[PDB]
């Protein structure tokens, strides 16, 4: 079904510098002659972008993997239609569902399904003497299709059946983002011919599609099309048939951009915010022409590098268990009080109990109770029926809260309660606990 | 990609809890949203109060944490007639332990063995090394404290993006050149609409220079750019020669 064909040749890496490209509309609204400043996940104007070259025309075969890292600014130029699509997947097997984006002449298919890929997946086309036509029946990229999740079919885009000879290279420049379960593919089709693949002329991108799919992909692959060629026996050459390609990949860093909208709604140009101090002045005045003078742009501060904390090494524990392991509790009319001081005591152990019916706290949220520390810790205890446990709280009334034990309105602490009918009840009733019912 | 008649939620009137957040409960059907997220699960009745913003405990801390900026409804009702099994139902599970509290709306599915104690057990259950999942065990005899409660959480999304979900409303013609607020498949138009041009790239929907001059009537069948302007508000003054001179 599938044949494994690996290679030993590896190409060296290279890098270059982006100049101006990478500006897209950050919203679906229309603004004319406006200098709106938008904060978004853009890319810096002067950035380093990785440059890769595909199969070199004796022949060199390679297939690299590039990190995604919160979107990718992609640029490429091809004319032989060698690039058919991409496959995305952390493992690219039946363990997890895999994404396959394929563009062909008939249509474009985006399949999110579990596909069993090989070590070196590839796609091939051939020609039939009897059919007098070409077809693609070499589905060696995947072996089995199970656990189908998503299938999307769209009409082909950004492909023109134009036949010309000369330096008619066409530039394709996309931006990939994946946020909040939404995949956004911005693009700009601008045919520009120039010796260097990365031009200088400014351009503004537009949204193309939006896929409402949430998936995290770390490693991907870009496939290729192999055309079968009939050679004479004297040639004795076979095994690989493909073309050549190259592309640029850059990353996006979130920051603020002051963007100039043309009267037609397009973008004439834009200026970064943190590129240079002049750009900071240009952004802080929302203008492009700054007259001579001194402008206050922002503030600068020195950031701390480490945190310092110290406490005595004795760390003697205080009897938080004394007011919790106590066998007998005083009645509410004579509530017992226990002072806690000169100690260290965590409060996550109360969580480890998880046996409390009500752990409601006031003044200080107990998510990080142990973070701070206090002048004095007071432990009070009593026993009441679960009817009025709710009224032992700041600003509460009732006979229990008005005649026996009343919290202050500015109270700051936790209230802890549980059910213990096991330890303080007996057949015929337990009459040890008495509560005050009347008072002036 | 559909209209949502939320009035049927009140029509059933069989829901124990319906209290909503960040949007009017009764007149919910009168607006439109960028997207409608429907989350569904089943939990214990005594813990349904935990599915709410700013709530802490077991479920809201360890399985399904609702964000503070949540704008949507929360729904619950009894399920004994459909989810009670004699001898206890053990199909349902709820996570008991976590390394840390989940981020809002997160979805934790991993079944890695939890290390409750100080002795590492290299992902093998044993003493104080527990399987994080655990069954509810719905006894049909059990009272309202331990009943199986089905919960549906609707998470809306309000933005300026194309609203795919919308209320029923009605259908009638369109008028312009006279200031009037109305609706046309999700429009407000508090002002006078003119047959402007405002050449705009065929992907945008709204439009404003400072506050609002939106256009592009939201009808999928017909699109047209309609400027939005006020209808000549103005102060009024009075000239009087003097009450003791004339009238």
């Amino acid at each position: 079904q599938c044949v494994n064909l690996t290679t030993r040749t590896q190409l060296p890496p290279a890098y270059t510098n982006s100049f101006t490209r990478g500006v897209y509309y950050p919203d679906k609204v229309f603004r004319s002659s406006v200098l709106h400043s938008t904060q978004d996940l853009f890319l810096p104007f002067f950035s380093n972008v990785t440059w890769f070259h595909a199969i070199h025309v004796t022949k060199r075969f390679d297939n690299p993997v590039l990190p995604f890292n919160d979107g990718v600014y992609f640029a490429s130029t091809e004319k032989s239609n060698i690039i058919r699509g991409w496959i995305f997947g952390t493992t690219l097997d039946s363990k997890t569902q895999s994404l396959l984006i394929v563009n062909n002449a008939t249509n474009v298919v985006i399949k999110v399904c579990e596909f069993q890929f090989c070590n070196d997946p590839f796609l091939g086309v051939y020609y039939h003497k009897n059919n007098k036509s070409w077809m693609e029946s070499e589905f060696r990229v995947y072996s089995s299709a199970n656990n189908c999740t998503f299938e999307y079919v769209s009409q082909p885009f950004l492909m023109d059946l134009e036949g010309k000879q000369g330096n008619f290279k066409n530039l394709r420049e996309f931006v990939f983002k994946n946020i909040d379960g939404y995949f956004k593919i911005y693009s700009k089709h601008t045919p520009i011919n120039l010796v260097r693949d990365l031009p200088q002329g400014f351009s503004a991108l537009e949204p193309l599609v939006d896929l409402p799919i949430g998936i995290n992909i770390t490693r991907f692959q870009t496939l290729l099309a192999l055309h079968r060629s009939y050679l004479t026996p004297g040639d004795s050459s076979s095994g690989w048939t493909a073309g050549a390609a190259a592309y640029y990949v850059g990353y996006l860093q979130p920051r603020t951009f002051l963007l100039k909208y043309n009267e037609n709604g397009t973008i004439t140009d834009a200026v970064d915010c943190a590129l240079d101090p002049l750009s900071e002045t240009k952004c802080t005045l929302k203008s492009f022409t700054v007259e001579k003078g001194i402008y206050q742009t922002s503030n600068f501060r020195v950031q701390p590098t480490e945190s310092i904390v110290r406490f005595p090494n004795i760390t003697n524990l205080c009897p938080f268990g004394e007011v919790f392991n106590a066998t007998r509790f005083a009645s509410v009319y004579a509530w017992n009080r226990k002072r806690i001081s000169n100690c260290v005591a965590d409060y996550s152990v109360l969580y480890n109990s998880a046996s409390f019916s009500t752990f409601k706290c006031y003044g200080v949220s107990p998510t990080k109770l142990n973070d701070l520390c206090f002048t004095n810790v007071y432990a009070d205890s009593f026993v009441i029926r679960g009817d009025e446990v709710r009224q032992i709280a700041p600003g509460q009334t009732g006979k229990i809260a008005d005649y026996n034990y009343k919290l202050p309105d500015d109270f700051t602490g936790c209230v802890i309660a549980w059910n213990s009918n096991n330890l303080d009840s007996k057949v015929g009733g337990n009459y040890n606990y008495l509560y005050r019912l009347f008072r002036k | 990609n559909c209209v949502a008649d939320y009035s049927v939620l009140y029509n059933s009137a069989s829901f124990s809890t319906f209290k909503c957040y960040g949007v009017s409960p009764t007149k919910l059907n009168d607006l439109c949203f960028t997207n409608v997220y429907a989350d569904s699960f089943v939990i214990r009745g005594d813990e349904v109060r935990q599915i709410a913003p700013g709530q802490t405990g077991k479920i809201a801390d360890y399985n399904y944490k609702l964000p503070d900026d949540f704008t949507g409804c929360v729904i619950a009702w009894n399920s004994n007639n459909l989810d009670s099994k004699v001898g206890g139902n053990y199909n349902y599970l709820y996570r008991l332990f976590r390394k840390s509290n989940l981020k809002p709306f997160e979805r934790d599915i991993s079944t890695e063995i939890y290390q409750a104690g100080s002795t590492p057990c290299n992902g093998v259950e044993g003493f104080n090394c527990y399987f994080p999942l655990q069954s509810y065990g719905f006894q049909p005899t059990n009272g309202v404290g331990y009943q199986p409660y089905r919960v549906v959480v609707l998470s809306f999304e309000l933005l300026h993006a194309p609203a795919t979900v919308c209320g029923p409303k009605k259908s009638t013609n369109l008028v312009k050149n006279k200031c009037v607020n109305f609706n046309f498949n999700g429009l407000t138009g508090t002002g006078v609409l003119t047959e402007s041009n405002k050449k705009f790239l065929p992907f945008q929907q709204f439009g404003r220079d400072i506050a609002d001059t939106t256009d592009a009537v939201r009808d999928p069948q017909t699109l047209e750019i309609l400027d939005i302007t006020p209808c000549s508000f103005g102060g009024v003054s009075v000239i009087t020669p003097g009450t003791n001179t004339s009238n």
Partner: nanobody
Framework: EVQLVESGGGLVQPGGSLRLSCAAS????????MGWFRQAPGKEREFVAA????????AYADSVKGRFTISADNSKNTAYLQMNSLKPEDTAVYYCAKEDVGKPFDWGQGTLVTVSS
């Protein structure tokens, strides 16, 4: 001295049943879970069963999967263990051990149980 009361240990025929109980009091009023271990003559200590004190989660060893039932009553503050299909190898001494938040597993004196016909 943390005292755990172990009851039910005694002689039992092969393929029988038993109900062992470990009762406790104290432990800073709050723990994380309770457990049962066993030690056979000529053999070291080994894990048998465990139940968390907060939830009903149960952990069983491979050699006792599906034939024991370990529960606990928080109100009674006592752990109960139900034994069925007593194999001859089960002859050992069983300990009830209480691990607490950052605390060892309270190791009682243990009780001897012998499987013989």
């Amino acid at each position: 001295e943390v005292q755990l009361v172990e009851s039910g240990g005694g002689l039992v025929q092969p393929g029988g049943s038993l109900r062992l109980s470990c009762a406790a009091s104290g432990g800073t009023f709050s723990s994380i879970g309770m457990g049962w271990f066993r030690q056979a003559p000529g053999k070291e200590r080994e894990f048998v069963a465990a139940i968390s004190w907060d939830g009903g989660a149960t952990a069983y060893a491979d050699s006792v999967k599906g034939r024991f039932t370990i529960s606990a009553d928080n109100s009674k503050n006592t752990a109960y263990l139900q034994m069925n299909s007593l194999k001859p190898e089960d002859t050992a001494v069983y300990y009830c051990a209480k691990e607490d938040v950052g605390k060892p597993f309270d190791w009682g004196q243990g009780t001897l149980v012998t499987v013989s016909s």
